Amino acid sequence: MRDMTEETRKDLPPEALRALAEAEERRRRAKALDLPKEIGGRNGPEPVRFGDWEKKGIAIDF
């Protein structure tokens, strides 16, 4: 939720950069799964179209 610049961070930490490094620590190929499948198309997970938004409130702004 944001409406005004107000406080501005400076030189954000390598949170995203480190995330990439952590993602590197592991790879799909490393898990032993090349995934040669392509011509096929099996059904997978699909949660119902359920959701709950509560934007309206004290913080209500734009």
Side-chain angles (χ1 to χ4, degrees):
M1 293 179 190
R2 62 183 293 277
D3 183 353
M4 297 298 294
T5 81
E6 290 176 1
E7 291 176 3
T8 300
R9 282 77 175 84
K10 294 179 183 294
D11 291 347
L12 316 190
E15 186 71 8
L17 176 59
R18 187 83 175 83
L20 293 173
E22 292 178 65
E24 184 178 12
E25 293 179 317
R26 63 183 181 88
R27 292 179 293 277
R28 184 179 293 181
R29 291 175 62 187
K31 299 289 198 80
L33 181 61
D34 182 355
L35 209 86
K37 293 175 76 167
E38 183 178 346
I39 58 174
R42 295 176 64 83
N43 62 71
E46 187 173 87
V48 175
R49 293 179 180 88
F50 69 86
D52 60 351
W53 272 274
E54 292 178 0
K55 184 177 181 179
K56 64 184 185 294
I58 292 169
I60 186 168
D61 77 65
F62 183 74

